[PDB]
Symmetry: C12
Amino acid sequence: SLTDLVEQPAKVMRIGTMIKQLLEEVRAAPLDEASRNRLRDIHATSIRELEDGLAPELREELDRLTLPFNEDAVPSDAELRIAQAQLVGWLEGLFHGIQTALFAQ
Amino acid sequence: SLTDLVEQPAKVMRIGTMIKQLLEEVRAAPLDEASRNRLRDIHATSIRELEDGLAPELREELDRLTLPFNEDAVPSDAELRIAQAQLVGWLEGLFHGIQTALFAQ
Amino acid sequence: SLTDLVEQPAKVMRIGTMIKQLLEEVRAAPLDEASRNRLRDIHATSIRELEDGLAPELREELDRLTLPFNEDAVPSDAELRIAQAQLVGWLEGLFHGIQTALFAQ
Amino acid sequence: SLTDLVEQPAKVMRIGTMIKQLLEEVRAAPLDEASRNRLRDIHATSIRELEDGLAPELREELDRLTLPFNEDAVPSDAELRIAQAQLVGWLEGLFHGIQTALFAQ
Amino acid sequence: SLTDLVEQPAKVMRIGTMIKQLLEEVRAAPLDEASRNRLRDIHATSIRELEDGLAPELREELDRLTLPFNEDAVPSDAELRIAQAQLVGWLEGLFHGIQTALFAQ
Amino acid sequence: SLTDLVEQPAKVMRIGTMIKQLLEEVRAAPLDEASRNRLRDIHATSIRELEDGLAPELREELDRLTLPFNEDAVPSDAELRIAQAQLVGWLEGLFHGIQTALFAQ
Amino acid sequence: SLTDLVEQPAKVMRIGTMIKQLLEEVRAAPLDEASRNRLRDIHATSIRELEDGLAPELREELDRLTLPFNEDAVPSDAELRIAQAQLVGWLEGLFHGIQTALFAQ
Amino acid sequence: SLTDLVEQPAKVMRIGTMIKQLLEEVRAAPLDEASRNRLRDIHATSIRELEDGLAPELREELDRLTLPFNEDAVPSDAELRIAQAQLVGWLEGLFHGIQTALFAQ
Amino acid sequence: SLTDLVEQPAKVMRIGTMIKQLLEEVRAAPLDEASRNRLRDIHATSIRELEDGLAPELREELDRLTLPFNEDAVPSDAELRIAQAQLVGWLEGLFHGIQTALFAQ
Amino acid sequence: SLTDLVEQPAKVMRIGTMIKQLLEEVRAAPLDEASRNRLRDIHATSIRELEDGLAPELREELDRLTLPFNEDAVPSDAELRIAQAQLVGWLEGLFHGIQTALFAQ
Amino acid sequence: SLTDLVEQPAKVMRIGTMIKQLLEEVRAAPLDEASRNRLRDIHATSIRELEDGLAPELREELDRLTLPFNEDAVPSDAELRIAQAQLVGWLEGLFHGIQTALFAQ
Amino acid sequence: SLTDLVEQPAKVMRIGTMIKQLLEEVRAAPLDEASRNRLRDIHATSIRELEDGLAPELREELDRLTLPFNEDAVPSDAELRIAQAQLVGWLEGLFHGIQTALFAQ
């Protein structure tokens, strides 16, 4: 069912909270080259961790939605904001959807 | 009936939340070329995912309402805002309408 | 009666929500040529969809009230604001009127 | 009686809401030539629609109060604001008066 | 008595609401020549309509209080504000006085 | 007694409301020559109407307190503000005093 | 006793309210020569009216406290503010004192 | 006792209210020479009136605390503020102290 | 005990209120030479009055804490603020301490 | 289970509070070279302490997510903000996840 | 026990309140040479008074924490702020700690 | 257990309150050389006092976390802010952790 989609919810929740805090921090003040490089590395590793904790259906959905960054160029602040906002929105919708079914029962 | 139109509501809800978060992010600060290119790709893939989760009637309605972006040019920030606002409004109306019938019962 | 005028309320409600969100987006920030062209296309298609969901009496009333845009020129932001405000006001009044009768019963 | 004056209240209410929304939109931001031309056309058609929905007594009262625009010149923003404010005030008073009698019963 | 002074209260109430809305509109933003000419015409016709709905005692009182505008000159914004404020205040006092007696009973 | 001093309270109340609204209007924005001339004429006529509605004791008191304007010169905005403030204060005190006795009973 | 000091309270209350309104008006905006001349005349006449309504003890107290203006010079705004503030404070204290005794009973 | 110290409380209360109102007026806006001269005269007469209404113990205490102004020079605004603040504070403390004993009983 | 330390509380309370009001007045606006001279004289006399109303233990404590001003120089505004703040704080603590014991009983 | 993952919760909670306070301090005002060097040393030692208090599964997860700083260069303020925000978000998610299970029981 | 540490609480409380008021006054506005000299003298005498009212354990603790000022130089405003803040914090913690034990009983 | 870690809680609480007050004071306004030297001395002595009041486990943990300042250079304001923020956060976490266990019982 809908609840069976999320394999382990705690890992997904903590990765989502980490990504949301990073997005808030980036929106707070502008970054520089090294900060954005670290941010891209975090984005890649966090997406991998999130995929490890999801069902294959949602793994494929998230793979279709998200596009990995180009490793040869340093992303700008706006690109990182777009990627993090997309991922935060997707997770916020996922948890809202599963909790809708949970509250329905 | 009205509720039978939405095939799987959870996917639609999470795609809508993702699109709303992206719209808020874009309204927050201006973007650049690569950010808008990523935004156009997200818009196309998200519309496809949304259509995969709707009835053929609503699929055709949304196809009539929404126009795909031109792949040969980078859309400006205003065009992306218009498209995302149109889609967010359409989904907000769709869920309001279906929940009106649900509350009616 | 008054309730029988609205053939299918869900479609009208969601088109109204889409148009209202687009009006808010246009009021938020100024647009450019392509954004206004897309906005005019959305306006035409949305009026057609709204007419498809109304009784012939209200179809004729809305036809008398609304004037289609000139396809040979790009409307300014103010003209689009005027048209969207007129349509949003008309729909807001329509639903208020029908719900007055519904609450009366 | 007072209630028998308003032939069909729903049409009057929705035309009033449309006119009020247009007035708010015009007060929000300044208009240009084409916007004001569209606004004058809306004003004429809306007054005709409103008169079609009123008793002959109120039709004559509204005819005495309102003066049609000159078709040979483009009205300024202030003239349109004055006309719309006058019509909105007249309708607000009309509904307040009829609802006073309704609440009296 | 005091209540018998107001012949038909609904017409007086709606004319008062129209005049109050026009006063608020004029205080909102400055006007130009044509707007003030329309405003003078509205003022004259509205005073006539108000007098048609009052007792001869109040007709004479209002005639003593109010002075018709000069038809040969365009009144300034301040003169129109003074006239509309005087009339709005007089009507606000009239209704307050009659409702004092009504609440007394 | 104190209540018998006010011959007809409704006329006094409505003249007081008119004068208070005019004072608020004058405080809102500055006036010009014609506006102040109209204001002086209103002041004279309003004082006469107020005196017609008061007992001879209060007529003489108000005559001692108030000084008629010079008909040969246009009063400045400050003089009109002073006169209107004096009259508004006197009426506010009069009604407070009579209502004190009324509440005492 | 304390209550027997105030001969007629209504006249004192209304003169106090008039003086307080005049003080508020003067504090609102600066005055000119004629306004201050009218203000001095009002001050003299109002003090005489207030004295006519007080016991001889309080008449003498108020005479000691208040100093009449020089009739040969136009008082400045600050002098009039000082005089009006002194009189308003004295009356505010007088009524507070008498109402203390009234509430004591 | 403590209550027997205040011979007549009403006079002290009204003189204190007058002095407080004058202090607020002086803090509101700056004064000129004649205003400060009037203020010094008020200060002297008010201190005498206050002393006439106090016990000999409090008379001597207030005499020790307060120093009369020099009659040969016009005090500055700051000196008058200091004197009025000192007297207002002393009276505020006096009444607080006596009402402490009154509430104790 | 703690309560027996304060010989007469009313005098201490009113001197404290006077000093607090003077401190607030000095913080409000800057002073000049004569104002500060008067302030120093008030400070000396107020300290003497406060000492006359305290037990010998608290007299010696306050003597150790407070240092009299130099009579040969005019203190600056900051020095007077420091001295008044020290005295206000000491009195605020004294009354808090005694009321702690009073509430304990 | 989920609760058994956190070996000792008190140490993790206090290290998280320390890191959060440091992040708030860094966001408050900009730092200099020595402050950032101290901050990097604190970051390394705090990560080691946090790892000492976590299960091997969470140790490996946090190792994958976090990247140690380069010891040969002084990180900029933005890099330190990014690292601290990532760690604060991860801990906030971890505790939210474990408390979800605790509240579930 | 913890309560036996504070020999006499009233003296400590009033010295703490005096020091807190002085700190607030110093933070309010900048000081000059003589004000800071007086402030240093107050600081020394107040520390001695506080030590006279504490147990030998807390006397030694406070002696270790606080460092007396150099008598040969005038401390700056920042040094005095640091010293007063340290002492206020120490006293605030002391009373919080003792009241924790008191509330525990 | 967790509560047995804190040897004497009152001393730790008061040292923490002192350090927090000093941190707030430093954040309030910038310091100079002597203030920062005094601040470094306070920091060293306060850390020693805190260590004297903790268990050997927490002593070693705090020793690992905190690095003593260099005695040969005057720390900048930012370094002192970082150190004080780290210590305040560590203590806030420590007390939160111990009170979690206390509330658990």
